Amino acid sequence: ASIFRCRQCGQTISRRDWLLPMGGDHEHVVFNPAGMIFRVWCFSLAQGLRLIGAPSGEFSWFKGYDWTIALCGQCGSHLGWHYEGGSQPQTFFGLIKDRLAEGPA
Ligand SMILES: Nc1cccc2c1C(=O)N([C@H]1CCC(=O)NC1=O)C2=O
Numbered sequence: 001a002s003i004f005r006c007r008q009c010g011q012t013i014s015r016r017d018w019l020l021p022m023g024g025d026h027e028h029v030v031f032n033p034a035g036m037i038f039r040v041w042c043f044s045l046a047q048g049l050r051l052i053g054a055p056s057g058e059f060s061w062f063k064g065y066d067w068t069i070a071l072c073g074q075c076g077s078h079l080g081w082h083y084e085g086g087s088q089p090q091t092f093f094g095l096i097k098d099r100l101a102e103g104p105a
């Protein structure tokens with residue numbers, strides 16, 4: 001249980017080693033304006049995604065950061081968001097825990 005894959009298809013996405021304690025905890029539970037609750041795990045790094053469009057600050061869960069939707073690059077499943085434009089770090093990924101599968105490298 002060291003690498004994270006897309007639950008829907010298997011695409012390699014991230015690694016346990018790349019978890020990022022933002023504000024002291026890698027896990028942040030948040031809601032969007034449609035009321036959907038997400039258990040977001042922050043990662044300093046991820047691969048295998050497709051980052052869609054240009055960034056937006058609207059509704060951002062992380063102060064100082066703008067977001068882009070992050071899809072699985074293989075199957076299109078919405079896996080989370082890429083955050084940029086901030087500070088320490090300038091960028092990171094916020095991925096929806098239950099949309100990944102954990103397993104051996
Ligand atoms: N405006 C809408 C409308 C529908 C769904 C979402 C947003 C929205 O902003 N986010 C996220 C994007 C990422 C973020 O940081 N905050 C959000 O509320 C959504 O899931």
Ligand SMILES: [Zn+2]
Nearest residue numbers: 006009072075
């Ligand atoms: Zn996928």
